[PDB]
Write a protein that binds this ligand. Structure first.
Ligand SMILES: NS(=O)(=O)c1ccc2c(c1)CCC2
Ligand SMILES: NS(=O)(=O)c1ccc2c(c1)CCC2
Ligand SMILES: [Cl-]
Ligand SMILES: [Zn+2]
Length: 257
């Protein structure tokens, strides 16, 4: 099916997912000079103290660290958000080289990777109903640059060997996502979509300005994962990112000046 190869990559998605050429597609380039400070934005609130991770899964496109969202534990609110958004999972997008990998770009600058913490609007009951609403999801995006190692990411890195191929999963409890956040919560926000099929336009994007630093060794291990399933020819899981899409009739707002 869809993927990131020459014959099933981003340029092919529109054939089965026409919304790929929609009016609010993601990711987008963040023109820092065109972005405008928005005083109407409320303080951003990331409350991950009671987060309960459960499992990590290689879905053949990336790997998801899943959380128990049956109760209001890890939640995101404030900022441009109305109501409470519950954390369901996080994953990354990365490249084959340090010079590429992120989906969103800043003044056309591409980072080595990008972390996506996915949340759904609790006023819709569950994730399924949420993705049928224009404000159903909120994704917190964080850029990754190569430099010093990120201590809080190591536990994720060391379990990847157990989920090398598509379909494989492993227990992953007691992981604290607070260890993946940068110091500052300054951010840019705009209305967008899922960056992979089905590309649903139900997302409020909140992209942090400050990137986190991860070591070359850590990202190198991300690149050892496979897109393929067990027993199939090896196709390294790299460059699983979608390029910037037309901003069209949208404005990116900044939480700072
Ligand atoms: N349109 S899409 O979802 O990218 C897609 C789905 C299946 C297949 C191709 C492209 C090419 C080979 C088979
Ligand atoms: N890359 S993204 O926009 O964060 C994204 C793309 C697809 C899906 C989710 C999040 C949640 C379930 C399906
Ligand atoms: Cl390939
Ligand atoms: Zn993503």
């Amino acid at each position: 099916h869809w993927g990131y190869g020459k014959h099933n990559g981003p340029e092919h998605w529109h054939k089965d997912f026409p919304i790929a050429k929609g009016e609010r597609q993601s990711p987008v380039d963040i023109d820092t000079h065109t972005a405008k400070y928005d005083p109407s934005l409320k303080p951003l609130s990331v409350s991950y103290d009671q987060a309960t991770s459960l499992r990590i899964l290689n879905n053949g496109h990336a790997f998801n660290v899943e959380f128990d969202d049956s109760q209001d534990k890890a939640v995101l609110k404030g900022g441009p958000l109305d109501g409470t958004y519950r954390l369901i999972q996080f994953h990354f997008h990365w490249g084959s080289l340090d010079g590429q990998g992120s989906e969103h770009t800043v003044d056309k600058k591409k980072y080595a990777a990008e972390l996506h913490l996915v949340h759904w609007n609790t006023k819709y009951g569950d994730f399924g109903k949420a993705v049928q609403q224009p404000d159903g999801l909120a994704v917190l995006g964080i850029f990754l640059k190569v430099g010093s190692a990120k201590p809080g990411l190591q536990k994720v890195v060391d379990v990847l060997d157990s989920i090398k191929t598509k379909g494989k999963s492993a227990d992953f409890t007691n992981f604290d996502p607070r260890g993946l956040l940068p110091e500052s919560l300054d951010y840019w926000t705009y209305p967008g979509s899922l960056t992979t099929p089905p590309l649903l336009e139900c997302v409020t994007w909140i992209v942090l300005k400050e990137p986190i630093s991860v070591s070359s060794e850590q990202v190198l291990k991300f690149r050892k994962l496979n897109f393929n399933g067990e027993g199939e020819p090896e196709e390294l899981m790299v460059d699983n990112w979608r390029p910037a899409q037309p901003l069209k009739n949208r404005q990116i707002k900044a939480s700072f000046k």
